[PDB]
């Protein structure tokens, strides 16, 4: 059949890679809706090329401007505005799959909407599982929704697991299918070989979107992918290890009971993982060239040092404490990173802020997206506080 | 359900690795029969530990000595002798799987016997597919036999393929399951980085640089990789577009599969045949194999090289022979046995191996198949090669 898609977050690189896969397979995929935040210029250009039934801007004022643009550029496209409209396109009867690529907290509610409607979820929003993993997994089970991870690392892990595990994310019994270890890999960031002593003097210039680059330098991003992997693959602390792989040719790996390791590799292009999320359990052309082993260079590996990457230790800790600790850590880390970029704090202060905040909250019925959002707020003020003190 | 095994070639390193997996999983696997050639001392020790229902020595005189040893040490083990008995244990009703690990041409007939009986075949004999691939695949299809490859590279490829392909070896439609190509890897041998000019003066000492002496020379010339190439074609039903060769000097990666969407899967591991063998026993599940997990802190750097035919002319011959059919692959293999022995005996230079293979291959190709016709061919080609070696001096 023809697979029908809503793309939430169409104007970013995930959206672009998704559309490149769709362009390469026009007989298999079709765009019913596109959605974005406030980038009208990019949206109108997309809507012109794709002439979707719906187009949504989260920002109601941006929706108005798009509506007036598309009167000329895509006159059969119904433009809509606001949070309720994102849920509307995410839950349409005709839609099979939702690329859930709206970043941040704003992505929670419409991603959750697609989940409750039992859609196939191409998950590219970090926050669904970092903040509210237990809740997502539970709602996924309740509605029959299929969860297909888009992030390079989780997608790689998915490909290296056996089929029975792939079809059972959230609830999987890894040990009974022969899996010993999931090996989550990352480059280690620009300070992979920098002496721990020199981390205090690191400037924003050296550490480097800008927030995400700092999360790469501290490996707090990896910690976040760790938290997500735990929920996606139902993994204990011992089933889930982190390996530094500086060249990022290998994207992650799975260690089996019989000694066998499976690794996924590829050119650095999100169209590969996204293609598999669209096409699973089949494969499609993604407009990505085959890997050129002529150009790959040497592949090396390092065990991560927690003195160098104290944020990664915090995430892993937080991970097995539960939604409250992960929601807190993430909140605190947004604030600490902004504070570092503003020159209010040193590079190595980021982790201290994260650690201070994490300790305070953990001293204390059912969780909800709202209760956790309030928590995110609580933890944000606490972090704002700590930053003034360390200065 | 308890899986019941016959092990053909139990006294070698494949047999040992297989038994190590079985020892680790005594609740899943059980040894019905053990078979070997003429090493009675090793067999009696194995039969004492394992108390199999049957034990077979290919050599009838070795069978007699074993029979008398086992009358007390393993009193419920029926000892048997000869080629017919290898087939008998390979075709028993109670047996689910046959480890086909008798090497050389002698392994053909009993391996084929297990195939015709529709057994699960844990294939560890190179010759079945190098000499007689068309015939094996056809017989596999005809009886419902499952092929599970034991060689490290083919096993790796198998693990990197999707399930529908894995369950359809011999007949698989790779392109319809999203496979663009199979990437067969190898170390490139000790002349990895050696100037083509210096290959003429290479000595047996240098060519051998743990594995036997013939196989090490086939690793130096990449003729082994050509042989694995031939086998892969038949196992995975791979066209000329779908099968590639990559040098990977460290051999941490064992082989890989390139998919349509750009994704590559690779299989890696410690160099221990219990890993591949374990999967052949346990498929589609996994079992402990008594192999340690790979340690990435200790793996070192992983690199890749491009092979060139000036350095590895044998590889070009094998690939050529591959798509010419059983006659050419049977001939090449025969000729290469002789040329390698001739090199080790200091009769010919290292670089003469390929010439011998090439001379012989040309002669035969100027002119319905059976294991016997192909065995006769193997002998024809052997005499032709014996001839060419005298002339190169
Ligand atoms: Cl499972
Ligand atoms: Mn990443
Ligand atoms: Mn091999």
UniProtKB/Swiss-Prot annotation, chain A:
Binding site residues for 1-deoxy-D-xylulose 5-phosphate: 126, 152-153, 187, 216, 221-222, 225
Annotated residues for binding of Mn(2+): 151, 153, 225
UniProt-annotated binding residues for NADPH: 11-14, 39, 125, 127, 209
Annotated catalysed reactions: 2-C-methyl-D-erythritol 4-phosphate + NADP(+) = 1-deoxy-D-xylulose 5-phosphate + NADPH + H(+)
Pfam families found in the cross-reference section: DXP_redisom_C, DXP_reductoisom, DXPR_C
EC class (word): oxidoreductase
InterPro entries (UniProt xref): DXP_reductoisomerase, DXP_reductoisomerase_C, DXP_reductoisomerase_N, DXPR_C, DXPR_C_sf, NAD(P)-bd_dom_sf
Keyword hit for Metal-binding: yes
GO MF, any single term: 1-deoxy-D-xylulose-5-phosphate reductoisomerase activity
EC number(s) per entry: 1.1.1.267
GO aspect biological process, one term: isopentenyl diphosphate biosynthetic process, methylerythritol 4-phosphate pathway involved in terpenoid biosynthetic process
Keyword set, alphabetical order: Isoprene biosynthesis, Manganese, Metal-binding, NADP, Oxidoreductase
Required cofactor(s): Mg(2+); Mn(2+)
Gene3D superfamilies per UniProt: 1.10.1740.10, NAD(P)-binding Rossmann-like Domain
Pathway as given in its UniProt record: Isoprenoid biosynthesis; isopentenyl diphosphate biosynthesis via DXP pathway; isopentenyl diphosphate from 1-deoxy-D-xylulose 5-phosphate: step 1/6
Function: Catalyzes the NADPH-dependent rearrangement and reduction of 1-deoxy-D-xylulose-5-phosphate (DXP) to 2-C-methyl-D-erythritol 4-phosphate (MEP).
Protein family according to the UniProt entry: Belongs to the DXR family.
NCBIfam families membership: Dxr, PRK05447.1-1, PRK12464.1
Record's protein name: 1-deoxy-D-xylulose 5-phosphate reductoisomerase
Encoding gene (name): dxr
């Amino acid at each position: 059949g023809m697979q029908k898609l809503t793309i939430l977050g169409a104007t970013g690189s995930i959206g672009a890679s998704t559309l490149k896969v769709i362009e390469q397979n026009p007989d298999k995929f079709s765009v019913v809706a596109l959605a974005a935040d406030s980038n009208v210029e990019k949206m109108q250009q997309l809507c012109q090329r794709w002439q979707p039934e719906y187009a949504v801007m989260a920002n109601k004022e941006a929706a108005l401007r798009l509506k007036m643009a598309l009167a000329v550029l895509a006159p059969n496209t119904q433009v809509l505005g606001g949070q309720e409209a994102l849920c509307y396109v995410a839950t349409l009867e005709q839609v099979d799959s939702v690329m859930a690529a709206i970043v941040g907290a704003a992505g929670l509610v419409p991603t959750m909407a697609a989940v409750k409607a039992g859609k196939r979820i191409l998950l590219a929003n970090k926050e669904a599982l970092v903040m509210s993993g237990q809740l997502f997994i539970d709602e996924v089970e309740k509605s029959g929704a299929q969860l297909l991870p888009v992030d390079s690392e989780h997608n790689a892990i998915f490909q290296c697991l056996p089929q029975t595990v792939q079809g059972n994310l959230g609830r999987c019994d890894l040990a009974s299918q022969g899996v010993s270890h999931i090996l989550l890999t990352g480059s280690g960031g620009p300070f992979r070989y920098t002496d721990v002593a020199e981390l205090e003097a690191v400037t924003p210039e050296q550490a480097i979107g800008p927030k995400i680059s700092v999360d790469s330098a501290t490996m707090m991003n990896k910690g976040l992918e760790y938290i997500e992997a735990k929920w996606l693959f139902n993994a204990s602390r011992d089933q889930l290890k982190v390996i530094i792989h500086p060249q990022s040719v290998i994207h992650s790996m799975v260690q089996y009971l019989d000694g066998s390791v499976l690794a996924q590799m590829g050119e650095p292009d999100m169209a590969t993982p996204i293609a598999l999320t669209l096409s699973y359990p089949e494969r499609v052309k993604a407009g990505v060239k085959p890997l050129d082993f002529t150009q790959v260079g040497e592949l090396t590996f390092l065990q991560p040092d927690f003195e160098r990457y104290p944020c990664l230790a915090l995430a892993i800790e937080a991970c097995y404490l539960g939604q409250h600790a992960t929601t807190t850590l993430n909140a605190a880390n947004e604030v600490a990173v902004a504070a570092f970029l503003a020159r209010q704090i040193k590079f190595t202060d980021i982790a201290r802020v994260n650690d201070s905040v994490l300790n305070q909250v953990c001293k204390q019925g059912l969780d909800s997206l709202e209760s956790l959002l309030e928590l995110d707020r609580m933890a944000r003020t606490l972090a704002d506080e700590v930053v003034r003190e360390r200065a």
